Structures are given as structure tokens and as C-alpha cells.
Amino acid sequence: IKVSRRRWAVVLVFSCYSMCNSFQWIQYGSINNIFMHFYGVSAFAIDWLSMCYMLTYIPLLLPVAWLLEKFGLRTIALTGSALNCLGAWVKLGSLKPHLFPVTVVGQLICSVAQVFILGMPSRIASVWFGANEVSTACSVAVFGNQLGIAIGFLVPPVLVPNIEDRDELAYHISIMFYIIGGVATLLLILVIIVFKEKPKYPPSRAQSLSYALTASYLGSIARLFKNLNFVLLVITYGLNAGAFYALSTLLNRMVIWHYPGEEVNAGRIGLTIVIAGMLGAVISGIWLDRSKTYKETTLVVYIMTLVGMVVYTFTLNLGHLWVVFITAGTMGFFMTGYLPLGFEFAVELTYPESEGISSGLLNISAQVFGIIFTISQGQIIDNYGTKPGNIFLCVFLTLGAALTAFIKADLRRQKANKETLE
């Protein structure tokens, strides 16, 4: 068994166009107050450019999983990169005040490519890396996707200033679309020449066993939904992860409403939320591995997410910009840090069911609640101001905190692991 040096280039290029794809998800929500003026549509319409990523994930998750297991890894990788590249070039045809529907068509194509990209953070690690490197390679793939959102907040406010003149505003928007289109096309060329179908030699003994080994999705889903403990965890995971999508999409609307101007600083808050959360994941992941106390750390971290919202909700309008950075950073520190806790707690409760099925339900719950929260909070912000909009998320996250408390620590995988040893 020998491993090839190509394994690091495979993840590096994958994390690059996953970074580009995540940029296009939030490139409209970071400058939401600017795209409203360019196209003349309301804030609800601009939020759809960030929510169509959520909608397409729900029905396309299962077929893409079947496609990935059928046509291999390279075919899905080419499809995901080409659609991401194709969607970026379609957007450049929408550089007119009246061509908003062209933007939606272009973003929907990028929305389809999101499913083909988020489907294999882990599968790339299995095929290309040995048993020791599976854990770190899977995190690097997720590392790029999260870092794309951080770039997606900081950059658009710098490239696109708040100009009343549509004709001059279109040039600045054109620069942003050209760079993303150029990067996506440049990475699409890279995907063609590096991503191969499989490494020349197996990377680990398990992969050799996996290749030699070579029920249905609906059969598994029935059994997981019989686990009451997992059903509660699915709901609580959706409330937390969905609150992240809702707040990220509406972050520009909340910040600009209380601080006129300062579009560039609103992007910095978005970067602060993501970057702090990226540090939250590694701390929570390391702590959970060492302590192995899945139930207690899930409740403590989930409560801190509620505490983050409470301090964020009331300190946003105090009139101080720096305190928003601290409150949003702490708020984002625990929201993204809860994601590794939810995944590990779900696999622990659903043993020996496949991790892909368990993680798929959590992701679907995240997108379903992301659409509900974004729609409901948007109407509340429009009609009742931004404070009831954030309070609405605080109330729901409080409901999730109680539901998590009733989850029984049925850590059956830990029981199974010690059973094999004895």
C-alpha cells in the first residue's frame, strides 16, 4: 500500500472551487442594500438569491448521492465545477437594471452545483488518503467551504460601492462577476487535469477492503425516524443551523438599518462571524474527541448560542460598532462550533446506520428551517423592525434548548466500541 502526492492537490483544488461556490451564495446578501437599488426589487427578492441555495439542496440531495455512487468521483467533480463555472458566466449577462430574472437563473445553476460540491467533503478523503489522514482531509474540504463565506462577506462591499447611478454601479458589479467567473473557469480547467478517477494504489487497508466489498435509502430513513432521540436531535440541529443561514442572509439588512452607510464594515462583521466560528469548530471538535461527553457539551454549547443571540439582539442598536463585532463573533463562535457536535452526536445515536444518511437528514433539516426562518424574519424585519426579527430567532433557539435537554444520551456506538474490545 502506497499513497500518492496528488492527494493534497486534489483537496486543494476542491476546496478552491468550493470556496468560489460559497462566495456566490452570499455575494448578493453581503451587499443586499446595493442590489435592491440596482434591480429595483425589494429585499425579499434579493434574499431569494441566497435562499435558492437552500431550496435546491432539499430534493437534489438524494439523487446526487445516487449519482456519486454510480458515476464515480471525477464525473461528479466535473459536473459540480462546470455548473459553478457556468452559473458564474450566466450572471454576467444580467448586468442591467431590468435583467433580474437572468440573475436568478444564473444563481440557480450555482445552487445546483452546491449539492454536487457539499456531497463529497468526506468521499475525497476516503479514496485519496490513508486511514490516519481521513479525519484531517475531511476538515480541509469543509475548511474551504466555510472560508468562502468569509470571503463572500468582505470582498463585495469593497468592489461594489453604494452609488446611486445605475450605469456607474454596473461597472463595479461587473468587476466582481468577472473575477468570480474567471476564478471558477480557472478552477474548472484545474479540475479537468488533476482530479483522476482513483489513485494508482489504495491509500489504506480499509480502502482495499472497501473496493473488494463493493439497504435502500428509504429503508434506512424509516428506521432512523423510529429513533425518537435522533428525531429530536434532527429538529434541534435544524433550529441552530437554520438560524445561521437566516442571520447571515439578513445580516446586511440589520446592520445597515441601524448604521447608515458602513457597508464595508457590515462585510467585516460577516467575516468575523464566520472566522470566529471556524475557530469554534476546531475547539469543539478537539474538546469532544478528548472528553467523549457528547450529551453535556452539546447542551452547554447550544445554550451559549442562545446567550449569543440575546446579547447580540439588544447590543446591535446601542450605537457602538465595535461591540457588534464582539457580540457577533461570540455568537458565531458557538453556532458553527455546534455543527461538529451535532454530526458526532447523530452518528453516536444512529449506530450502525451509515453516516451519510444520518448527516443527510441533519443537512435537510438545516435547509428546511433556514428557509422558514429567513422568510419569517424578513417579514418581521420589514413590518416590525429588526429587534423583533432577532427576538424571533431567540425564542426559537430557546425552544431548541429545551428539546436538547430531553435528549437521552443513548451513546450506543460507544457501547458497541467497548463490546468489540471485550
Numbering used by the authors: 78 to 291, 295 to 502
Article sentences:
Here, we show that FLVCR1 and FLVCR2 facilitate the transport of choline and ethanolamine across the plasma membrane, using a concentration-driven substrate translocation process. Fully conserved tryptophan and tyrosine residues form the binding pocket of both transporters and confer selectivity for choline and ethanolamine through cation–π interactions. Our findings indicate that both FLVCR1 and FLVCR2 operate as uniporters, facilitating downhill ligand transport independent of sodium or pH gradients.
We determined structures of FLVCR1 and FLVCR2 in as-isolated (without exogenous addition of ligands), inward-facing conformations at 2.9 Å resolution. The inward-facing conformations of FLVCR1 and FLVCR2 exhibit a close resemblance to each other, with a root mean square deviation (Cα r.m.s.d.) of 0.993 Å. Both structures feature a wedge-shaped solvent-accessible cavity that is mainly created by the separation of TM4 and TM5 of the N domain from TM10 and TM11 of the C domain. On the level of the outer leaflet, TM1, TM2 and TM5 of the N domain and TM7, TM8 and TM11 of the C domain pack tightly against each other and thus shield the central cavity from the extracellular space. In line with an alternating-access model, the inward-facing conformation of FLVCR2 features a tightly sealed extracellular gate created by interdomain interactions. The interdomain interaction between these two motifs is stabilized by a hydrogen-bonding network consisting of two pseudosymmetry-related asparagine residues N110FLVCR2 and N332FLVCR2 and E343FLVCR2 (TM8) and N239FLVCR2 located on the extracellular loop connecting TM5 and TM6 (EL5–6). Furthermore, we identified a stable interdomain salt bridge between D124FLVCR2 (TM2) and R333FLVCR2 (TM7b), reinforcing the external occlusion. Our cell-based mutagenesis studies show that alanine substitutions at N110FLVCR2, E343FLVCR2, D124FLVCR2 and R333FLVCR2 individually result in a significant decrease of choline uptake and an almost complete perturbation of ethanolamine transport, highlighting a critical role of interdomain interactions on the extracellular surface for FLVCR2 functionality.
